Design a binder for these strands. Structure first.
Ligand code: NA
Ligand SMILES: [Zn+2]
Ligand SMILES: [Zn+2]
Ligand SMILES: [Zn+2]
Ligand SMILES: [Zn+2]
Ligand SMILES: [Zn+2]
Ligand SMILES: [Zn+2]
Ligand SMILES: [Zn+2]
Length: 197
DNA sequence: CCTCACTAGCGCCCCCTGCTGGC
DNA sequence: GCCAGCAGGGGGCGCTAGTGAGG
């Protein structure tokens, strides 16, 4: 095989070896004109132009969804149709379509929290979980109830609000040991831990 | 030396679950 | 108890930068 010897890359073919050498140049000739982004190859620029237009030539056969690139279609089929999960955990039976989700799962086994909050001691196992935690410091309430226009910090909190205040005839939870009617399952658990040990 | 799939990595957002603490 | 705040374990998509290989 051929050896790049700059990043220790091996490739049996001679055309892909020369293509890999162009990866080190870090110069982007092809420039979009709608925006300022520049690209290395025409194929990436053409895909970028398709994202502007919304043109999605890669159409899934099993549903009415389409994607700009063939890679997105492959991931979609694994998520929705084939249910192939190539990346498997070595400590349990969990498997994921993508690497980052397996790595997120692995940090649950180990307890690693590599994403530190810059305002307090909190640290998360997910980058996006840190963003959600930031709303505790900024006081942001991105979600709004479409009925009473109340605002909430989490989407799931808003959904519970709609169920418990705008939905009629919702089954409630009855305490097994006393005649107490409780609307929320978690509040029933609190009631059991308080007046029933 | 084309061409299109497949891979790796970044980001986005939501889901459900279940608890906490002010009221 | 009611209620919004809030964290933990997850799924699915948007977009880019590469690689593998039939042709
Ligand atoms: Na396993
Ligand atoms: Zn190299
Ligand atoms: Zn553009
Ligand atoms: Zn599909
Ligand atoms: Zn595991
Ligand atoms: Zn913080
Ligand atoms: Zn409401
Ligand atoms: Zn009771």
């Amino acid at each position: 095989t051929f050896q790049c010897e700059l990043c220790s890359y091996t490739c049996p073919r001679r055309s892909n070896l020369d293509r890999h050498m162009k990866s080190h140049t870090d110069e982007r000739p092809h420039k979009c004109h709608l925006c300022g982004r520049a690209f290395r190859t025409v194929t990436l620029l053409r895909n970028h132009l398709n994202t502007h237009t919304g043109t999605r030539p890669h159409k899934c056969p099993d549903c009415d969804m389409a994607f700009v690139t063939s890679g997105e279609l492959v991931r979609h089929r694994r998520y929705k149709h084939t249910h192939e999960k190539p990346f498997k955990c070595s400590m349990c039976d969990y498997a994921s379509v993508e690497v980052s989700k397996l790595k997120r799962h692995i940090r649950s086994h180990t307890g690693e929290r590599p994403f530190q909050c810059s305002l307090c001691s909190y640290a998360s196992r997910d980058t996006y979980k840190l963003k959600r935690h930031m709303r505790t410091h900024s006081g942001e309430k991105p979600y709004e109830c479409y009925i009473c226009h109340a605002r909430f910090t989490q989407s799931g909190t808003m959904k519970m609000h709609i169920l418990q205040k705008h939905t009629e005839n919702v089954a409630k939870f009855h305490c097994p040991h006393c005649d107490t009617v409780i609307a929320r399952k978690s509040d029933l658990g609190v009631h059991l831990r308080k007046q029933h040990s």
